[PDB]
């Protein structure tokens, strides 16, 4: 890979009439997938990260919003980043989005981190747009290459032994962090079980304990579940994504859990802000929110 050339081309569309594509060659994109897979597999499936860093939720192919996030947060490696999954689907430029993220992972592997979301799954992104985008601009074989890459993404992260991060939420199957560590990669996301729950579950204020999730996949969990999880694992905060929230961030269970969502005006249907959470060296958390405007 010539990673510098790739990043330069991805970044040079800044300020262009939004919607403008970057057409990397097929072999460069394949290259990003192959090299990032190597990096993902060589690093832990449960990341151990140190603050300061910036944490973002769902991007969903909103490439020009991703560029704005970097403009406000600082371009790598000026700031460290942890993304919480859902890079593709339901947006207009998933290819550019995932290519820039993989490129940054390759260039700054210890300053830049990506977790797996429920859309980083062939069965989901075949339907919700990514497959169609790949087919239109390249071919099926490239989409399949992406799936092999996604199957190797890490699943969760712990920041300074105090903040537990994952895309979806908790699992009633989860008793020790070691269970996450013993998940072998590459793997698909199962229709049920621990890995499914980590990518699909949701907090719910009206559930006591665990409940069946209205989505029809995985579970909901209540505030006392969060409290017991934190107490058991000596943690202060759960940081997750996976739900559109009006201000881009939303607290649950007296600030013991936070939901982050980083795609403003998602699907052009919600009028939600996108948020980015900064965690300083002392673990003070602050929020920057991108509010959509006419």
């Amino acid at each position: 890979l010539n990673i510098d050339s790739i990043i330069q081309r991805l970044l040079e569309v800044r300020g262009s009439k939004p919607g403008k594509n970057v057409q990397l060659q097929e072999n460069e994109i394949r290259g990003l997938c192959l090299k990032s897979r190597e990096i993902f597999l060589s690093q832990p499936i449960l990341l151990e990260l140190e603050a300061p860093l910036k944490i973002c939720g769902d991007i969903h192919g909103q490439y020009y919003d991703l560029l704005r996030l970097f403009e406000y947060g600082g371009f790598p490696p000026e700031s460290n980043y942890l993304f919480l999954g859902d890079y593709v689907d339901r947006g207009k430029q998933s290819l550019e989005t995932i290519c820039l993220l993989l490129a940054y992972k390759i260039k700054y592997p210890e300053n830049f981190f990506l977790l797996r979301g429920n859309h980083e799954c062939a069965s989901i992104n075949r339907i919700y747009g990514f497959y169609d985008e790949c087919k239109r601009r390249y071919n099926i074989k490239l989409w399949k290459t992406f799936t092999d890459c996604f199957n190797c993404l890490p699943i969760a992260a712990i920041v300074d032994e105090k903040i537990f991060c994952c895309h979806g939420g908790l699992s009633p199957d989860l008793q020790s962090m070691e269970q996450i560590r013993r998940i072998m990669r590459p793997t698909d996301v199962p229709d049920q079980g621990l890995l499914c729950d980590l990518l699909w579950s949701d907090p719910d204020k009206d559930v006591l304990g665990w409940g069946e999730n209205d989505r029809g996949v995985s579970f909901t969990f209540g505030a006392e579940v969060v409290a017991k999880f934190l107490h058991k694992h000596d943690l202060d905060l759960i940081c997750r994504a996976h739900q559109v929230v009006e201000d881009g961030y939303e607290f649950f269970a007296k600030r013991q859990l936070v939901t982050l969502f980083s795609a403003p005006n998602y699907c052009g249907e919600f009028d939600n802000a996108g948020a980015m959470m900064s965690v300083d060296e002392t673990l003070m958390c602050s929020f920057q929110i991108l509010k959509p405007a006419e």
């Binding site: 919003d65 105090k162 202060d236 929020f287 920057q288 959509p292 405007a293």
Partner: peptide
């Protein structure tokens, strides 16, 4: 170390994000 939260949120407005 202990997680704490800054009360002050920084807000930005992104023109063009309605009706992309």
């Amino acid at each position: 170390k202990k997680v704490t939260f800054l009360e002050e949120v920084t807000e930005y407005y992104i023109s063009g994000d309605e009706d992309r």
